[PDB]
Design a protein. Sequence first.
Length: 109
Amino acid sequence: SHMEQLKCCSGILKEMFAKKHAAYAWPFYKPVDVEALGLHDYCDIIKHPMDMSTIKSKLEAREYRDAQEFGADVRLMFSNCYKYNPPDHEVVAMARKLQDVFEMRFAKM
Ligand SMILES: Cc1cc(-c2ccccc2Oc2ccccc2)c[nH]c1=O
C-alpha cells in the first residue's frame, strides 16, 4: 500500500533527524547555503539541490506518489554531496554514515 509505505518514509526521515544521528546528519538538515564562502560554484555543479527539510515538506504536501519517489530524493541528496565534494572531504564521510541509516531502514520497510 502506497499510503502505508509513505507513513514508513515519514518514520525513516524522523529517525534521520533524531539526536542519535545528529553528529553526522546535521549538514543535511537544511538546503546548502550557496552564498557561503567556498560554495560559489555549487549551482553550476548541482542542478537539483535536495535536503532533509525539503523532503519533509514534500512528504507533508503529498508530492511523492510512492516510497520509490521519496527514496529518489533521499538518494539525490546524498548523490549531490558525492558529486560536489572531494572523496576525502569530512562531509562525504558524514553522508556515508547517514546513507547507511537510510539504506538499512529503506530496505527493511
Ligand atoms: C551536503 C553538504 C553540506 C554542507 C554544509 C552544510 C551546512 C554547514 C556546513 C556544511 O559544510 C560542512 C563541511 C564539513 C563538514 C560538515 C559540513 C556542505 N557541503 C555539502 O555538500
